[PDB]
Structure 1
């Protein structure tokens, strides 16, 4: 009977090493084999409500004649084995895909879908070379784990992401275990204490000493904290260089305030030439898909459009798993939520064709320190040679507010920045009030001429939309850790007092700055706990006591011979 199905729980699937993973099978009432969709999940396959509201109404797929397989990852919940993040997922996915393809009920066409960790596992599956995998749909995902979510393109540790995720998975690992232990109860309390106060947890020095988290999940230290360079340990689990040779259709979803955004978008660019790639980007953070934030509301249309997403996924899988050649007729290649106008808009490509990468130069009379300083932004090079100077003290970093926070206050992406504007280490540069709209849609970066009293330090840049009422709404930001200015792989220190031209990767945005608004850039040397704090020593940052760290007098140079600027992806639509 069409629309009817059955569910088989805890079907045990043998991996190559004999370890069995648990799956649930959602199989339609049908008279032959059917196309199959796989979801690989470290948060209990049973608990479908927890993640699905962030993805698709995927029971519609089953009602429409797809089978759906949901799997517990190795060493979690009903699965056998031992859990270590990322390292087993390529092989386990290959073996899982092979098993599905052998079953009576599978017609030889398999796809995947799902969000975050359920998205990363899809790239790991796609590089396996299993011919029966016809399409993937990675949402809020990354193909380079160093670049997201653990470190970043600037070479700073995403400390809140690491500690929050570890505490979340830690809670799962305890719940999953062979038999309850006497220390379980106290461990839960401590994990809850971390999740209630991630910035506090991230503030303890040395950072690398994590009694609880290091015991529950040794990987947190052995892999992540201990490998600050993008070295061979990271390349091993990286998929990105392999993406260019793939020919697998991918339905890619991202959020402007999502921790994975830079890497999600990069995956689209990497696969678009060789296969049918699609892109959907909304104004969401990892834990807030509602479109509603404390000081910024995007409208009901901004709410994660789960039924539209479900329709689009089904059309996509119909095209690639069911060979229906017209299934994606009328479906755009790219669909973006353009903030400011606060509207969804169809595009033919990402980056947008007809992006004008435009420098906006830092300038102004007198110090740009604080929002009441003299800092300006202009499409013209600054006429006079100036410098803004501040003290960066690791004991007092600039607090993270909005942006791409995951676990520490990760539900307020477009955060009002006014609470940090009277700080002396926050340099502010803004345009005049705009008489006419300026659209900024694409990847964003800064080029700054900088110097320091230290042999290492950080520089941050943050793009901000200043509203008529004074709200200064965060759009996108990045960091450069100076030892990694040239390379993430082979860092070198800087000479105190010497001027360097450095790039800051500020990820991406889509915003129309409307008449009455200003374009604003904040520059500093910290953004904590989004990124860990640079010790200003040149040492092994995660191994240093706070008292071992140094302050740094940092300087931004601006003028004709040091034309520091932000590069904005300008779109003009008449």
Structure 2
């Protein structure tokens, strides 16, 4: 009829294999024949478009240029039929929805997907179904292994602030969506708001498996997550990662240096790049702050999330794979990253970078290394003297979390200043001398330590930091290991008191230039709360224990010629 015009239809119903119906809205352009189509799957109400779109694209431009778009409510929420349970229904429900679209008289045979966070995980669940008409995807800030992110981790400890925050949010949604109110609704709303104003206080109640409010409204919180600490049968059935090597579907991938999903986002790129056309973009953002401005650190206006440039890139990508235009991606790079320290964008040909040198930095020093005014050092040469550092860990007084990859508890300040915790006795410090030449670090990061303990189970932690001329000490990346899971996440065994073990710690990834006049620094301890839950030091079932039945431990770090403890850094020199 007329180029650039369109129309909208509400509440169209779509049948699943068991008889349940799900509701959708349709945005269709004026046209003289069938067109290409794009799909989104959402658990936060399909009507409320303004709440998520500012974190994605200006997608009405796609419709004005001739694409149709479909938005859906997931099973058991808002306008859809059925009952709601996280993750377990999403693979089959996507298969049945894609089949329905291909049956309509307005579809030309070509389909794709886009979206962020939970709207990103649903895209990988669709890709393994085996439907021929799906041509390309674009998942932002997401994961394909739900144990590794966001509920547990590669070290085998529970992410307690993430679980309690998300659950209270879904609960508040169910109360507000009802027409006819229940008698208990008014009091429940008051208690839910008290959790969100103080997440750390709510995580402090023992035993942890006792949740009168949250357990009543959503049984899944206890029946699946808290009751299953090993990476066993229940978790492996909802994992997609092992099947990714057999596919051949193109994917446009996005991430952030201070985002909770960052480790697992990068792993998906490495797994698909050999078999199809993949692309990557990485900025300095956290999950709830995309501005580029923080309390003690500013990156500049070029670091603010660039919504118009992202809209242009997505459209070129679909024109190639859905419309078959062979020259649509001309002059577009393979990898694009924001390099901190110098604070500017830069283009590359692969990830990991092709000219990388993995280099050990050794722990040493005369005298004890306790606090920031002790005597710990870092060097590229092996230490000459044999020594050991010692401290006491008490579960009733843990080290508090400050910045990093937090989601709901104070999650708007990623590059935080560390000075408020520097003078604790259970925090060991090691650093280099003041630098005269610049040093670049870009890639994956980890550590190898020699340790011992007075109990049959405990935890160990490590963290990388940048020290400014004016005194500021800014955080970069971190990780943890729980001792019973030192060799395997599937079949755990306890340790022997007083014996020495060699262990590895996964610290995710970063990109930063350390300038002349700065120092490189490392922090080592046994806790980080409420980012991770606290170890009891007994060897029993942690989530079922009272505070008064836990105990303290004496822990040690060994260093020298026969025990060479170190951190491994990815150096770039051009």
Given that 1:78 and 1:176 are in contact with CA atoms closer than 8 Å, whether structure 2 keeps it comes out as no
Distance in 2, matches of 1:434 and 1:27, equals 60
SS of the aligned residue for 1:187 comes to helix
Q: CA distance change for structure 1 residues 434 and 8 in 2, over 3 Å: closer, same or farther?
A: farther
SS of the aligned residue for 1:242 comes to helix
Q: CA distance change for structure 1 residues 502 and 109 in 2, over 3 Å: closer, same or farther?
A: same
Distance in 1, matches of 2:177 and 2:385, equals 64
| RMSD (Å) for aligned C-alpha atoms | 1.4
Given that 1:461 and 1:524 are in contact with CA atoms closer than 8 Å, whether structure 2 keeps it comes out as yes
Q: Which digits, 9 at most, give the CA deviation of each residue in 1:75-129, with x for residues without a partner? A: 1122221111111111111112222222222222221111110111111111111
Using the TM superposition, give the Cα deviation of residue 177 of structure 1 relative to its aligned residue in structure 2, in angstroms: 4.5
Q: CA distance change for structure 1 residues 455 and 271 in 2, over 3 Å: closer, same or farther?
A: same
Using the TM superposition, give the Cα deviation of residue 185 of structure 1 relative to its aligned residue in structure 2, in angstroms: 2.3
SS of the aligned residue for 2:76 comes to coil
Larger deviation, residues 121-130 vs 171-180: 171-180
Larger deviation, residues 259-268 vs 169-178: 169-178
Larger deviation, residues 3-12 vs 120-129: 3-12
Distance in 2, matches of 1:400 and 1:265, equals 24
Using the TM superposition, give the Cα deviation of residue 31 of structure 1 relative to its aligned residue in structure 2, in angstroms: 2.1
Given that 1:394 and 1:549 are in contact with CA atoms closer than 8 Å, whether structure 2 keeps it comes out as yes
- Structure 1 residue runs of 5 or longer lacking an equivalent are none
SS of the aligned residue for 1:296 comes to coil
Given that 1:110 and 1:321 are in contact with CA atoms closer than 8 Å, whether structure 2 keeps it comes out as yes
Distance in 2, matches of 1:121 and 1:19, equals 19
Given that 1:483 and 1:491 are in contact with CA atoms closer than 8 Å, whether structure 2 keeps it comes out as yes
Using the TM superposition, give the Cα deviation of residue 286 of structure 1 relative to its aligned residue in structure 2, in angstroms: 0.7
Note if 1:19 corresponds to 2:20.
yes
Using the TM superposition, give the Cα deviation of residue 7 of structure 1 relative to its aligned residue in structure 2, in angstroms: 2.0
1:259 is aligned to 260
SS of the aligned residue for 2:102 comes to helix
Q: Which digits, 9 at most, give the CA deviation of each residue in 1:478-504, with x for residues without a partner? A: 111111111111111111222111111
Q: CA distance change for structure 1 residues 179 and 321 in 2, over 3 Å: closer, same or farther?
A: farther
Q: CA distance change for structure 1 residues 365 and 28 in 2, over 3 Å: closer, same or farther?
A: farther
- Larger Rg belongs to: 2
Using the TM superposition, give the Cα deviation of residue 178 of structure 1 relative to its aligned residue in structure 2, in angstroms: 6.9
Q: Which digits, 9 at most, give the CA deviation of each residue in 1:41-100, with x for residues without a partner? A: 111111111111111111222222222211111111222211111111111111122222
Distance in 1, matches of 2:263 and 2:447, equals 15
How many residues align? The count is 573
Runs of at least 4 residues off by over 6 Å: none
Distance in 2, matches of 1:430 and 1:30, equals 66
Q: Which digits, 9 at most, give the CA deviation of each residue in 1:449-505, with x for residues without a partner? A: 111112111111111111222211111111111111111111111112221111111
Using the TM superposition, give the Cα deviation of residue 364 of structure 1 relative to its aligned residue in structure 2, in angstroms: 1.9
- Structure 2 residue runs of 5 or longer lacking an equivalent are none
1:444 is aligned to 445
Distance in 1, matches of 2:60 and 2:378, equals 51
Using the TM superposition, give the Cα deviation of residue 322 of structure 1 relative to its aligned residue in structure 2, in angstroms: 1.8
Q: CA distance change for structure 1 residues 179 and 248 in 2, over 3 Å: closer, same or farther?
A: farther
Q: Which digits, 9 at most, give the CA deviation of each residue in 1:357-386, with x for residues without a partner? A: 211122222222222222222222222222
TM-score using structure 2 length: 0.97
Given that 1:391 and 1:425 are in contact with CA atoms closer than 8 Å, whether structure 2 keeps it comes out as yes
Using the TM superposition, give the Cα deviation of residue 32 of structure 1 relative to its aligned residue in structure 2, in angstroms: 2.1
Q: CA distance change for structure 1 residues 178 and 98 in 2, over 3 Å: closer, same or farther?
A: farther
SS of the aligned residue for 1:410 comes to coil
Given that 1:77 and 1:175 are in contact with CA atoms closer than 8 Å, whether structure 2 keeps it comes out as no
Using the TM superposition, give the Cα deviation of residue 171 of structure 1 relative to its aligned residue in structure 2, in angstroms: 1.6
Q: CA distance change for structure 1 residues 178 and 233 in 2, over 3 Å: closer, same or farther?
A: farther
SS of the aligned residue for 1:462 comes to strand
Matches within 5 A, 1:125-136: 125-136=126-137
